[model samples]
Target: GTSKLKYVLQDARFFLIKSNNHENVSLAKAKGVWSTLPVNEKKLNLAFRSARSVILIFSVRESGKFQGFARLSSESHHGGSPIHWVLPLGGVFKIDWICRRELPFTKSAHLTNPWNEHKPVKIGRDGQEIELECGTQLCLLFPPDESIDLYQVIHKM
Candidate 1:
């Protein structure tokens, strides 16, 4: 069900939420730098135009091996505005590091669990804007039996 699925997405970013739950964390900056967003032509361009760089950083959240990350870069003088795009609902993608030395090239790559794609359906549109209702599930790129890393895209501000 969608409810079960939403948890997975939120759980993936649990560390992120925990890190700045009390502070005024910039979601635009966080999503831009988050490695889980899907990596597509439109998404990649959006990330770069909105964020400083697409990066692949990871951390251990639970007691398990749920570790992986990726990023999108922005060329704007002050980090352009974040773009809003929908992520596909299935499969895992690779999380890669952004080549800061280069203007528009990302280098290096790694693997993690099924943590790349997004369940947009799980996150539906509300009356005013898109919203993440409770009971949503997060994606698991890697099964409980395997380990892999994937990339995905999210809305940039």
Candidate 2:
């Protein structure tokens, strides 16, 4: 007599895209880079609840003036989309950093991956906010004095 075995397919989601043409921009990756593990998963959820795809909003500290903003997206197995300029803040700004974090069950068991790395602290002007759309489940890495906040909402259309 002989015996045989069969197999089945399983669905899975993994990889968080911090940016398309950039690296060391993701908070998760950045944490690893700095020799630090991700904050408590619950806190991570709080941050992510704000935005998975983030748009950089920059401004000057001296005059509290507007600089500019950029639309950023995440690259993940879930097939994410780009963070477009759904809204404008003010003047010409820069993309200091970008980060993406997927859901708990959507990530791989292996932690280290692309977009995950340590980066020098970014220094720039003040008065900025990141608008994360759809995906709001990533912990951001903004400094204490940065004066950044998160606003979440649902799209009608």
Candidate 3:
């Protein structure tokens, strides 16, 4: 019976890390505090305020594999404030995807759980790019403006 179930696990390669500071600094400093720096120098300064929040977007490839994660810390050793980050629920943050091929088939693709109800929302499609709004689990991961596309050899798996 297990074989009858077709489980599609989409892996997002190109991820983005954003800062909650007034500048809204994203990877490669797209439009935020870090935007002033050069393209090569932008990635060096990803960490911002101790209590910062960010948004991460994981895209699924034609093959099923999803990969994206972020970590926040508020612990300072030099007697600093007990800083803590907050990933607001519901409408506070938004996640999206750009699927190229047909949408994956899953039994509960749109179902919501107790922790998070934000699911990938299909906004629009342009040629091979399928835009999808994803749930907010973690942000501030991956490089900015870089393609998370899997290597040709690995994608075949």
Candidate 4:
């Protein structure tokens, strides 16, 4: 198994807020002048604020089995905290699929099967569509737009 797999939130906006007066002063000084400073002088107290978005944090054990998931949403509750009910019965969601040719022989042969086919599920006229399948079941298609929330589909399932 891999020791490190970095999963970043695409197009996420980050805000660094000054938690103390020294941080504000440091930020102002850095923006005003291009001067070098000591490491101690450069230290500042800051708070990280991320934009409202859906994030799924998961882990795989050394045995290659899933440990659990912690889902976070900035818009759901005050501040930011993990939402425990995103997946029902510990179900998982797939974002992208491996190419048919790239998949293992056993799986590649089933790509064209009627039950494995992906079909669109219309939600709006904005050219944004969702799809669903029932072979393994609990599969969902989401819009290409990252700004669109997936709570509707999560709740539906």
Candidates ranked by lDDT: 1, 3, 2, 4
Error of 4 at 11 (Å): 1.8
Per-residue lDDT of candidate 2, residues 1-157 (tens digit): 0010000001111122222222222322333221111332222233323443333332222322222222222211122232332221111111222223222322212222222232111122121121221111122222222222222111100
Candidate 3 on 23-139: residue-level lDDT in tens?
A: 232231221111112331222224223113222322233322223322211111223222233222111121222221222224224533232333332211111111122333122
Off by over 4 Å in 1: 1-46, 64-69, 73-94, 98-157
What is candidate 3's TM-score against the reference?
Answer: 0.21
TM for candidate 1 is 0.19
Using lDDT as the yardstick, the better of models 2 and 4 is 2
The C-alpha TM-scores of every prediction are 0.19, 0.19, 0.21, 0.19
> Where does candidate 4 stray beyond 4 Å?
1-10, 13-48, 67-70, 74-157
Worst 10 residues of 3 by lDDT: 1-10
Predict model 3's lDDT versus the native. 0.24
Candidate achieving the largest lDDT: 1
Candidate 3 colliding pairs? 10-65, 10-66, 11-65, 11-66, 12-66, 13-148, 14-148, 95-134, 97-132
Clash numbers, per candidate: 44, 17, 9, 0
